[PDB]
Amino acid sequence: ETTALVCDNGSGLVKAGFAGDDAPRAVFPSIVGRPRHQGVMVGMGQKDSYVGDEAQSKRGILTLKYPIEHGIITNWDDMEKIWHHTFYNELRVAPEEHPTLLTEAPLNPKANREKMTQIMFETFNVPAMYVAIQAVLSLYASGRTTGIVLDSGDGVTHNVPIYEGYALPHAIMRLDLAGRDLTDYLMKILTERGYSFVTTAEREIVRDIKEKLCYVALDFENEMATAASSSSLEKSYELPDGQVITIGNERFRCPETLFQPSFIGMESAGIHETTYNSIMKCDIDIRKDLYANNVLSGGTTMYPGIADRMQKEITALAPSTMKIKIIAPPERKYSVWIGGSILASLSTFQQMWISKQEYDEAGPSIVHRKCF
Amino acid sequence: ETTALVCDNGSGLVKAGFAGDDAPRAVFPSIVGRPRHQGVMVGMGQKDSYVGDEAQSKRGILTLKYPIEHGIITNWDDMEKIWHHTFYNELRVAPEEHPTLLTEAPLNPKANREKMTQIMFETFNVPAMYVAIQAVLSLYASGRTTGIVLDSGDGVTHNVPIYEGYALPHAIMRLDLAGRDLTDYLMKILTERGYSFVTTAEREIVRDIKEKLCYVALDFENEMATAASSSSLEKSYELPDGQVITIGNERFRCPETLFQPSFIGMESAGIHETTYNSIMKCDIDIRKDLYANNVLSGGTTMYPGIADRMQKEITALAPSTMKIKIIAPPERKYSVWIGGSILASLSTFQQMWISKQEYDEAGPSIVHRKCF
Amino acid sequence: ETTALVCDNGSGLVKAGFAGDDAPRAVFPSIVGRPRHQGVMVGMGQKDSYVGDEAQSKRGILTLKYPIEHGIITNWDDMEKIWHHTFYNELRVAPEEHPTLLTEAPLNPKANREKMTQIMFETFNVPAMYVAIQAVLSLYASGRTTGIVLDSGDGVTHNVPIYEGYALPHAIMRLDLAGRDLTDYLMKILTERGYSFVTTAEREIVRDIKEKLCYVALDFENEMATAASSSSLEKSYELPDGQVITIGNERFRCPETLFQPSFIGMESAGIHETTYNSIMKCDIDIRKDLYANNVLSGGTTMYPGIADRMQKEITALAPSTMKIKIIAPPERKYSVWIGGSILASLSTFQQMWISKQEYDEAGPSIVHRKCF
């Protein structure tokens, strides 16, 4: 059978590999570096485009750009570079031999779904392809046809009620606030403590810090009080040039913005609130199988202690005769990619692919007839 | 003798099973469903139509419709999906090896009797069949050959005087009000209290509520006053997604429409008025037994306290020297099916069947020669 | 005689003024703004509550709330703010000198009719008051005493057959889908085109767009085809920060949900269908005046080209020996308020008002003995 490349379009990490395997085989940063100055390398070759880990090692001399900003492809040129690198550098295979599965947000722009369909088929010459909602794949990785997924990426958070494998198009909710924003916010609040960070390279350390040291508090006022009353809510981090910095209440404050969007000046409601409001758009006999399967997904959900917080919050908004229970997969950061690996290796799914012939007949439009 | 399948054509519950048994083998909802959208399920085999407990549980994907509305078959294609489900899913038997007995309302349209007869001999290939009035079977199940039946079924209410055999064909009286419109009415009057409902998934819980909590008042003004003077005429119900609702005077108001059809814009006489107007058409030497034996039948008569109300009402209409009694069977919801189950087991009844040979010789017209 | 304030409880526009005038004298948005942040204004006074146009100018710094969501008062506090502003800011008069006429949906909750009666009388100290179903006033504004009104507001849609003084309570049909929903839907389908709107302020531009650019197609498939075959079904709109956006097929798709509720997951039937199913519950001797007088009312009906669509749809459901004809008033958006102004000006109507004494005797409950 044809080996399908599953490529998760994560906004701060690419996750890529082959279908039928239990885990991604390449996990690298979504970063394209291009030179700030030319002349840097003399006696050695210069290139102008570095991608992923190659770019990461050269960060000092590169201008980093993100291909995907807030789950939205913002530059077609940087999306292409990521792709060129995925196939030829990272997996070292011809894409033209391998069908492609691409991941997307709910309500991912149609003009974008098309430019993605077109770019894959004309330049890479893919034999077949498909595009699928991130949360639907994470639900298949959770072994379920039906449930509501809180998917919080490295850039967007969605609440996605799904039923018999279809995401409910009137009931889904979105929040632009997650891992990308979270770094920029963390950096702000550290400047406020007097650990000013103004350089973007230092920003990436702040990113790493965030992933390692942030934790979801179970009670925001009680932990805040604890940090005000004692310095036991602080963890040290040694910067790689030396210099020991102390990260305080910023640890739980940073992700606190997910529950209270007003802290960054939004009119948006919180991730627990949009969970509750999303299920309340659904019919009562499916509210049962939706509430019974509240699933966490994506990189932002890997902060410890999140389940007890989300269990709390949802039981407080929701009536005490729906079964409330948080499902947190063992490696929830990958559950989109794992769900794509499952879906692309089902014998029933092989009828669904966009073929090169259907693209030649209808142009990039074909995704809006084959994908749902 | 050959085992007869007895099918109760109920407008809200189908009742089904083998003849010669004291109670029905299958009691399931009168519902049929079809997909709301193109594409309906992933990871398991799709179906073009759904019935019974599968339609009641897998509800969210389905446009539900009802095969029998208002005591009348309203869509042939859904009545066939009930019958196909009944033989092959529920009783798991071949109907082509068994006679079939169908229940009906009085004054059933000739075109409907013919289309049912034709479906039985040509869709289901049956060796034999018969069709019988609900009230006649309920009276026979009660151990009697003479009396008047107030058959307040699922979808219609009928008044049916019977003597030493068959119903009196000139004396029968009808009202277009029973358990079907009772749900829709209940739902209206709850919106009025400020417990608005809009979803047909809510309407089926309102249905369940009605069956559990409605009660026939003995005195309508005195109970109404009691509820206006005190909140002791209210019972709580916890909905299946939490949220405790309080059902008030709606409990007795809902069924009050049976006595006063002007509450819902109808011109018709009430269940007691149509009882009296039916008995007054009967012959004087049998008026004695008809007034003495007033029999309750059907799902709508299972509200508590109905007998004392009906005893009252009929004694007020009819003179005080035919000695009125209400006969309420122990399981009066089922007496139609139980009467068919008893009757179809008798050696004297085996001469009444419409055979496949008589259908070959006379076509659909045969039912109007063989039925009474 | 006493000058009556007629106040239409519209869900996205308040319309208010004095009885006996031919048009509203204040037309402003139903919006209460309260501060997202305090500290915004330094050296100038801050207030915490802005209402109507005052709120509109300050939208950037305000959290907007609707007093009335889907024709249902959802917050008593925001309803009060609208009122306080109506009397003292907008009309600059003492309400305690002026009797009041309020407007409501059919089946408007009784607990709500009472909290409205109570709030008007205790706080505002009104001398007398009345409450009327929106559609019943729009019939009088159409110059008529019998007919069927379709009323589609900025939040709910109503079907209301009326005869010489009564609306028929069994024949009325309601749908929650109209102008409020229509904005939220429009916004979703624009994100889908790739004009993502995620901010609520931008939502209000989307509201304005909807009112200006939406049009009812006469044939949904033929216009849809036209937009697929040519870009001549698109109108430009320049956002007030600059940036020219192009609004496509969304123009006719947005209101298309009124004819096909399944587009947004609802189990309900279309506005045409519920017009037909409403008239078919009425008496045959009055149907002759109902079908001949389909009166259109409310803000959602002001999309061009509605009548030819409605004429079509209704003749297709209805027999061709009822005279079918759409009556669309010259300024149908105001017909509720105009009908209230007409009704409250009649010397025969001065006997109908709820008095302060009857409120002191019976509490808020008095409305159900005076309003019909």
Swiss-Prot record, chains A, B, C:
Q: Name one GO cellular component term.
A: glutamatergic synapse
Molecular function GO terms recorded: ATP binding; hydrolase activity; microfilament motor activity; myosin binding
Q: Which reaction does it catalyse?
A: ATP + H2O = ADP + phosphate + H(+)
The record, for CDD domains, names: ASKHA_NBD_actin
Q: What does the entry report about post-translational modification of this chain?
A: Oxidation of Met-41 and Met-44 by MICALs (MICAL1, MICAL2 or MICAL3) to form methionine sulfoxide promotes actin filament depolymerization. MICAL1 and MICAL2 produce the (R)-S-oxide form. The (R)-S-oxide form is reverted by MSRB1 and MSRB2, which promotes actin repolymerization. Monomethylation at Lys-81 (K86me1) regulates actin-myosin interaction and actomyosin-dependent processes. Demethylation by ALKBH4 is required for maintaining actomyosin dynamics supporting normal cleavage furrow ingression during cytokinesis and cell migration.
One Gene Ontology biological process: cardiac muscle contraction
* Residues recorded as bearing Tele-methylhistidine in the entry: H70
| InterPro entries referenced in this protein's UniProt entry, alphabetically | Actin, Actin/actin-like_CS, Actin_CS, ATPase_NBD
Gene for this chain = Actc1
Looking up SUPFAM superfamilies in the UniProt record yields:
Actin-like ATPase domain (SSF53067)
Give all N6-methyllysine modified positions.
K81
Q: Does the keyword Hydrolase apply?
A: yes
Record keywords? Acetylation, ATP-binding, Cytoplasm, Cytoskeleton, Hydrolase, Methylation, Muscle protein, Nucleotide-binding, Oxidation
A single Pfam family it belongs to is Actin
The protein's predominant localisation is cytoplasm
Q: Localized where?
A: Cytoplasm, Cytoskeleton
Q: EC number(s) of the enzyme?
A: 3.6.4.-
The note filed under miscellaneous reads: In vertebrates 3 main groups of actin isoforms, alpha, beta and gamma have been identified. The alpha actins are found in muscle tissues and are a major constituent of the contractile apparatus. The beta and gamma actins coexist in most cell types as components of the cytoskeleton and as mediators of internal cell motility.
User: Can you name the source organism?
Assistant: Mus musculus (Mouse)
What is the recorded name of this protein?
Answer: Actin, alpha cardiac muscle 1
Self-association state and partner proteins as the record states: Polymerization of globular actin (G-actin) leads to a structural filament (F-actin) in the form of a two-stranded helix. Each actin can bind to 4 others.
Q: Which residues carry this modification: Methionine (R)-sulfoxide?
A: M41, M44
Q: What family name appears in the similarity comment?
A: Belongs to the actin family.
